[PDB]
Amino acid sequence: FKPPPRPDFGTSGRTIKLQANFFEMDIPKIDIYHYELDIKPEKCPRRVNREIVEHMVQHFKTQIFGDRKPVFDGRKNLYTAMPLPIGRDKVELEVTLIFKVSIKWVSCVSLQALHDALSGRLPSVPFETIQALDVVMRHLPSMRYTPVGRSFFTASSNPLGGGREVWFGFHQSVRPSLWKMMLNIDVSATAFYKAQPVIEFVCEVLDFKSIEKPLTDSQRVKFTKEIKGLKVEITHCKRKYRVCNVTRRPASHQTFPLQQESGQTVECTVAQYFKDRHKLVLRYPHLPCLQVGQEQKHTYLPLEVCNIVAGQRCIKKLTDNQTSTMIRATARSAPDRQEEISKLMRSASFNTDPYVREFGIMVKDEMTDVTGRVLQPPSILYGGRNKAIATPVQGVWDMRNKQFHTGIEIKVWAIACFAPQRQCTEVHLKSFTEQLRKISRDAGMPIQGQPCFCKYAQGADSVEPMFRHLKNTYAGLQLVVVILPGKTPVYAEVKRVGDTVLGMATQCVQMKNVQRTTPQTLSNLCLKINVKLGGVNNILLPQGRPPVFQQPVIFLGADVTHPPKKPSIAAVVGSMDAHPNRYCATVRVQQHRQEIIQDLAAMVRELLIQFYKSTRFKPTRIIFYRDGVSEGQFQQVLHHELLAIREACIKLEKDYQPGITFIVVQKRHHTRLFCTDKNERVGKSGNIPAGTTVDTKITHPTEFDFYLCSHAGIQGTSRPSHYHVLWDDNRFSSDELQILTYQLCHTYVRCTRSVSIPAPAYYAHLVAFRARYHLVDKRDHQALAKAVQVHQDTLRTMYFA
RNA sequence: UAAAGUGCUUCAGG
């Protein structure tokens, strides 16, 4: 259950000078002293815990703390550069403007042991000491800013609408590497709720110009969904409350049981209560109240008395417009991002931070220099008369003068237009149809003739009936092209009845994309169609593939998507040929927010069986790309899931023991690489080139991991995918695994570009995403798992493309 | 829903 050591360093590829947003730390060899704090009352927000500790140090200089400057993680851990005049536990009081605070020695954090571990002598890096360093480095900014996870934010207006806005801050964390510790610094931007009166909040969320008329059920529900769980503060007295719900009734009629001077209790309206007790005549008695605290204490607050508390990060899903504006506002070219980080470093001034200097730490001002390697891309073999070989350039190629490897001929297909005939006319349909055939012929997926059926529809209630009709009627029906008028629930039903009921291949298309056609678009559309019908768009040039393909091998991609309770969705896909091109999908509904794939064993078993049925081979090796995992989970994830994979093999055959390689894929980190030489910048965004690989300098000191930017940066700064090998029975060299991983990024069939993660990992995402739409209704557990199960025929092919 | 990439993505009280 221990990750294997780095076997070697890669040598393949053209060298490339890079800078990473990792800054060398000079750490002393001294011993750090760790103390534990028990603060009563407990479960106070880390913020107030810090204020308490702050006043504690200021107040107890005379006796306890002296000249030194302690650091504090906000909870129970206090660290010092030199030992305190403590040898035992000590109890003390703190009055904020009363808290019981005790302090007891825990143990000495050894930085020398860390030095040694970084040189590679010790089997494990003392996580405790790294944590200690992290506490030192972020103690100051923790007092100066609003900490959110490992990031820090402050107030600049960058509105997104709907009561939300995007704040700019920075990420900070201490990381180990070979020889030395590193400080990772990056810009970050995330959504927050604007600090404002709740009355203004309802306006922005319900699209009112001015509050002004009670609320309709529709409005109340939308308002409830938005404010539920948010903190508010009262303006009629300052205390904060968390919103449990929004009353159905208006403040004028909403009541609560108040006990009179005599033991008798009477129902009193919120409005009347605020009139008598607070002398306040509610200006908006017709609006609902916020229910806070306990359901049992009946605490309701008028809207006009509440403000949305400042500093609350938005977690609920953003709208498409909000997401669009945020992406626009946050996109930075690589050169621009590098400069922003240099500014952050300058204003961070770590080398003048009294707490950093207190612990004798020093941080280098310049980014770490690292030599990357630009791996050669694989050739892409197409099929047809030409059998053309496409050579990716800058992570991109095209299909001009090329035809699908194994292109499917379409003799029977139907068009179902759910867009109003007014906008999408017969003229548009036959113009679109004509051009699609034309393009389909160029691509080698010949649409042999006109559609056998074409009708308009609406309501999303006409889907299954029409589909029942098409299947029973037209023999050998291959494809049903569906046309939608923008976002709509019909898409969900189309995929539900298509994938989950009748088992028919469907390809949706926006109304706007049939009105005005483009060769590229229609061409990209053919990529999905040919695949959905069982075709092979292309394959890696058979020769030039890594030696792993010398024996039957299966590639698995796994991911878990969590909703914004509703269950999480686990998806595992497996390759079904030697190219590898075709994948089968397994999917499961599981516990809300559970990271581990509960039913992995059974999912892997299903895939192994499908693989054997397809290839008549039993995999000698299983290559398992796992996306959506964190460092805090590598141990637990590897344990259950590695075992589950083994269990699948055993449950299949007593002595079937293929070599397993377990690789975690991570896009969600703050490692950024920049070209040192301007001439190596690609595109307007000036990013590193596709294929850029780094397995030195900023990587794990002992274990087997590497960064690989497999994709071309289009806009903003590229995120190099990180790959961590948690287990390897197959004893890959660094080069082979890195090349293999890069080539798998070229097998993704939705586009003729190298994508940012291996195809199987990507497909897993698509499968889980598709499951969402399948679960859309109109919760019996057995029914959820059932609304996610796919039709027999469809399971053989990549319906999720 | 042509596509990829880019930002995020847990203690008078009523």
Q: Can you tell me whether residue A113 is helix, strand or coil? A: helix
The CA distance from A557 to A576, in Å, is 12
Q: Which protein residue has its CA closest to C1' of B13?
A: A299
The CA distance from A661 to A651, in Å, is 19
Question: Using CA of residue A678, residue A683, residue A684, residue A685, what is the dihedral sign?
Answer: negative
Q: Which protein residue has its CA closest to C1' of B11?
A: A239
β-bridge partners, A480: A414, A506
Whole-number distance in Å between A330 CA and B5 C1':
14
Pure H helices in A67-171: 111-119, 127-144
Whole-number distance in Å between A524 CA and B3 C1':
6
Nucleotide nearest to A754 (CA to C1'): B4
Q: Which residues contact A250 (CB under 8 A, 6 or more apart)?
A: A214, A285, A286, A287, A288, A289
Q: Which residues contact A530 (CB under 8 A, 6 or more apart)?
A: A404, A407, A408, A443, A445, A537
Is residue A24 within 8 Å of A89, Cβ to Cβ? Answer: no
β-bridge partners, A389: A381
Whole-number distance in Å between A463 CA and B3 C1':
26
Q: Can you tell me whether residue A574 is helix, strand or coil? A: strand
Q: Which residues contact A100 (CB under 8 A, 6 or more apart)?
A: A38, A39, A40, A91, A92, A93, A94
Nucleotide nearest to A487 (CA to C1'): B1
Whole-number distance in Å between A288 CA and B13 C1':
19
Whole-number distance in Å between A41 CA and B11 C1':
13
Q: Can you tell me whether residue A340 is helix, strand or coil? A: helix
Nucleotide nearest to A271 (CA to C1'): B14
Q: Which protein residue has its CA closest to C1' of B7?
A: A327
The CA distance from A173 to A668, in Å, is 14
One-letter identity of residue A211: I
The CA distance from A798 to A748, in Å, is 12
Is residue A68 within 8 Å of A82, Cβ to Cβ? Answer: yes
Nucleotide nearest to A715 (CA to C1'): B6
Nucleotide nearest to A190 (CA to C1'): B8
Q: Can you tell me whether residue A435 is helix, strand or coil? A: helix
Q: Which protein residue has its CA closest to C1' of B14?
A: A299
Q: Can you tell me whether residue A505 is helix, strand or coil? A: strand
A639 known member of a binding site: no
Whole-number distance in Å between A63 CA and B4 C1':
63
Whole-number distance in Å between A674 CA and B4 C1':
21
Neighbours of A100 (CB within 10 A): 12
A627 known member of a binding site: yes
Is residue A419 within 8 Å of A484, Cβ to Cβ? Answer: yes
Name the burial class of residue A392, with classes exposed (0-12), middle (13-18) and buried (19+) by CB atoms within 10 angstroms of its CB: buried
A677 secondary structure, DSSP code = S
Q: Which protein residue has its CA closest to C1' of B8?
A: A190
Neighbours of A23 (CB within 10 A): 20
Neighbours of A1 (CB within 10 A): 9
Paired tokens of A235: 């303006």
The CA distance from A628 to A560, in Å, is 7
Nucleotide nearest to A800 (CA to C1'): B1
Paired tokens of A711: 């994709």
Q: Give chain A's length.
A: 801
Q: A489: closest CA among A795, A775, A219, A222?
A: A775
**How was this entry determined?**
X-ray
Whole-number distance in Å between A258 CA and B12 C1':
11
Q: A403: closest CA among A446, A449, A447, A435?
A: A446
Q: A315: closest CA among A234, A240, A225?
A: A225
Paired tokens of A679: 């001439």
Nucleotide nearest to A269 (CA to C1'): B14
Beta strands in A597-653 (DSSP E): 621-627
Q: Which protein residue has its CA closest to C1' of B5?
A: A714
Q: A74: closest CA among A39, A38, A49, A106?
A: A49
Q: A740: closest CA among A538, A540, A604, A537?
A: A540
Nucleotide nearest to A234 (CA to C1'): B13
Q: Can you tell me whether residue A149 is helix, strand or coil? A: coil
Whole-number distance in Å between A188 CA and B8 C1':
9
Whole-number distance in Å between A766 CA and B7 C1':
21
Whole-number distance in Å between A402 CA and B10 C1':
48
Whole-number distance in Å between A140 CA and B11 C1':
33
Which residue shows structure tokens 């999912």? A603
Paired tokens of A487: 């976002």
Q: Delineate the domains of chain A, giving CATH numbers in brackets.
A: 1-193+314-373 (no CATH), 194-313 (2.170.260.10), 374-543 (3.40.50.2300), 544-801 (3.30.420.10)
Mark the nucleotides of strand B covered by protein, meaning any atom under 7 Å from a CB.
1-11, 13-14
The CA distance from A665 to A557, in Å, is 10
Whole-number distance in Å between A313 CA and B10 C1':
10
Is residue A470 within 8 Å of A454, Cβ to Cβ? Answer: no
Paired tokens of A604: 């892997």
Nucleotide nearest to A331 (CA to C1'): B6
Whole-number distance in Å between A422 CA and B1 C1':
19
Q: Which protein residue has its CA closest to C1' of B10?
A: A315
Q: A751: closest CA among A528, A488, A533, A599?
A: A528
Dihedral angle, C-alpha A560, A639, A650, A568, nearest 10 °: -20
Phi, psi (deg, nearest 5) at residue A5: -75, 155
Nucleotide nearest to A511 (CA to C1'): B1
Is residue A304 within 8 Å of A196, Cβ to Cβ? Answer: no
A501 secondary structure, DSSP code = T
Paired tokens of A733: 């060299």
Name the burial class of residue A90, with classes exposed (0-12), middle (13-18) and buried (19+) by CB atoms within 10 angstroms of its CB: middle
Name the burial class of residue A790, with classes exposed (0-12), middle (13-18) and buried (19+) by CB atoms within 10 angstroms of its CB: buried
Phi, psi (deg, nearest 5) at residue A791: -60, 155
Nucleotide nearest to A313 (CA to C1'): B10
Whole-number distance in Å between A731 CA and B8 C1':
37
Neighbours of A678 (CB within 10 A): 8
A777 known member of a binding site: no
Paired tokens of A724: 């961590």
Phi, psi (deg, nearest 5) at residue A221: -65, -45
Pure H helices in A331-462: 334-348, 354-358, 426-443
Nucleotide nearest to A564 (CA to C1'): B9
Is residue A251 within 8 Å of A269, Cβ to Cβ? Answer: yes
Paired tokens of A523: 């061409």
The CA distance from A315 to A4, in Å, is 37
Which residue shows structure tokens 């497909």? A763
The CA distance from A761 to A717, in Å, is 22
